[PDB]
Homo-oligomer: A and B are copies of this chain.
């Protein structure tokens, strides 16, 4: 149990207590944090967590207490991943997903991976829950898609709002101004839309920001937060919208256009949702 010693420290215990109270409270009173933490040393720990910006103090006309900050939630997830030897160091923020921040991380051996920290919700309670669910969904769908030979990063690990995955050696399509053969890349992006639809899925946000181009000009999909089922009554519109977004990008960036693009009637169903739901339930159990 030596690997879990940092999870036993007082600051981690108090941070976990703030997270626990945040399940039913928008602002966690110190008395409740102290009661949950069951360490006394509590107030001194709270003051250091505030100093390190891991928690923030909040006053309401009826309540006073603390909330976990984004840095505090990141700390809990990153220390958990560190205990498993998955993440030893966190580097530069490389980019953004629709509802997440992307960083390069390294394990003890120095091998690099991508870390996605999910951030969703406009209240403390829904932020805690939605960020975790968004990461859980990404890990479950990434696993289900990777097993079906889809071009997605290999999923490595998960904790709270954090997903660790394979670091793709490439750049998002939005940062690419020159490509050797625009037609091949356009065909590869269109084939991804088709493969998804044949598996019952419509991306919903298919664009130059979530498609990574490697040194061989091969595309990897790295963000898919709000996929639509091909069974949705308005699935055709969602499918056509994804096709059109990539057509607009190829015209604007590469001056490339084609009359050869996918049609929703051309889909032929080959289940991903069943596998992803099974993985989500396994993760929810733990």
- Contact surface of A with B, Cβ cutoff 8 Å: 26, 96, 98, 122-123, 125-126, 129-130, 133, 207-209, 226, 228, 232-234, 237, 241, 244-245, 248, 273, 276-277, 280-281, 284-285
If A96-B233, A123-B284, A207-B234 are given as contacts, then 13 extra A-B residue pairs at C-beta distance below 8 Å, sorted by A number, are A26-B285, A98-B232, A122-B277, A122-B280, A123-B281, A125-B284, A126-B133, A126-B280, A129-B129, A130-B133, A208-B237, A209-B237, A241-B245
CB neighbours (8 Å) of A245 from chain B are 241
Overall SS of chain A's interface: helix
Contact check, B207 vs A237: say whether CB atoms are below 8 A apart: yes
Identical chains in the assembly: 2
Contact check, B284 vs A126: say whether CB atoms are below 8 A apart: yes
Contact check, A244 vs B248: say whether CB atoms are below 8 A apart: yes
CB neighbours (8 Å) of A234 from chain B are 96, 98, 207, 209
| Min distance, Cβ A50 to any Cβ of chain B, angstroms | 21
Q: How many angstroms between the C-alpha atoms of A277 and B222 in the bound complex? A: 29
6 closest A-B pairs by CB: A122-B277, A123-B280, A96-B233, A123-B281, A209-B234, A123-B277
Closest to A209 in B: B234
20 examples of A-B residue contacts, CB within 8 angstroms: A26-B281, A26-B284, A26-B285, A96-B233, A96-B234, A98-B228, A122-B276, A122-B277, A122-B280, A125-B281, A125-B284, A126-B133, A126-B280, A129-B133, A207-B234, A207-B237, A209-B234, A209-B237, A241-B241, A244-B248
